[PDB]
Amino acid sequence: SITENTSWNKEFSAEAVNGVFVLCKSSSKSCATNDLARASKEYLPASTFKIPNAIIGLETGVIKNEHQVFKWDGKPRAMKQWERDLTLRGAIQVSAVPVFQQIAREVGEVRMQKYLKKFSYGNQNISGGIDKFWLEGQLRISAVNQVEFLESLYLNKLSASKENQLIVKEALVTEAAPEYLVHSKTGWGMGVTPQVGWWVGWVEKETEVYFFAFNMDIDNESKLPLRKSIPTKIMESEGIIGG
Template sequence: MKKQIFTFCLLFLLFINASCQKKDTKSSEIIKPEFDKILDSLNVKGSVLIYDLKNKIYYSNNFSWSKMGVIPASTFKIPNSIIALETGVIESDSTIFKWNGEKRRFKKWEQDLTLKKAFQVSCVPCYQEIARKVGVERMKSYLKKLNYKGMVFDTLTIDNFWLEGKSRISQMQQIDFLKRLYFSELPISKRTENIMKDIMKIEETSAYTLSGKSGWGMRNEINNGWLVGYLEKNNSVYFFATNIEKEETNMDEFPAIRLNATKEAFKKLNILN
């Protein structure tokens, strides 16, 4: 009888301990009105979401926006590149996409591009070629394997579903995916992971390294811009997903605004000086 009581007490304590540990690992959310001021000064609206991994805190000016699904646009080039490498559709980051000589939307796309360069200049035709080669069945299979949800496509939309249509991803989901990539929790080869971490680098200084991917799509006929990624500094990592909207005025500044908004938010948190 004593043995049974002891066993019961031990199990109960283990249960309580496990429950406490689970509670301790839950992340908190802190609203930062300062981020709103940054966006207002840049004449845009939206949300900057930053996740402080060490302290398990999400910071944002608008958590409702950060949990809302939006077309992923060119941020989908991250999973698209992973799938291309894992399936062998693309051999390496130095694989070349041959330009066929046809006029493209941007001059920087009108040349032969390696995978690395195509990713960094966000060459849409290059990644449409990848998607067509991967095909519907393999794309669906790998997205399920990567737990990258919310993509809607078929044979007719395989090469544009991340740019238009019903595909949706939230800022919270973007950060979840990036965390799993960063901490080697995706079911992919180490080689693919290393290639991705290299081609995603945006800025590398003596103080920090900023990695990620931008995206530009439309939501309700309004320009919608993404910048997702992570910042490494002093042996710490911070994940971010910025999603903003801007009316059709002086759109030449739109790409820079996403980066400026994100970096200014990091400054408000005293992470960047």
């Protein structure tokens, strides 16, 4: 029942990129997209996988609780922003891949498989190595499936404790005003061709809720801000951002 809104395409052509936005009001039963085909196409999740990985980390006890500090061992990491002790929120905010690869390692394949099945997480293919599958492996998930998973998270309906779902929700908050709250997560998947850029999340505005998932083909770093600006312009046209 997802509907196509072809006018949204102008926000993609204005920036010379290919991609999809899916936007649902209230539930995943009222969704619209600029491109019906791509809305259902599955792409490497990259750093958006920190959302399930975090929940799974808490459920399995690998992450002890919300106050867990991920200590840096001092050995060098691929970005300087990652070279420091991090909270769960901090590790999510900076997209600290090494923290999550250690989480995945301790969770292990059999349990990670079990959770991705419970979560109906895309093609649930975690081959490509326990700490790499969402980065250069065979895992793939669509914008539509992202929206469905995030709706279950918002509702505390994933197969995980309410407490753990709440902890991860707080960690994902990226904008806050009295009657406007955004939970969101970016991704940039360099380990696939073409590279994929993601922005997924949900907006609570007054008493309404909107689920969203965006992805695009990324040539390189310079186009990364479009992951937020294109969704922002669509949501503005829909009356979500302003008043």
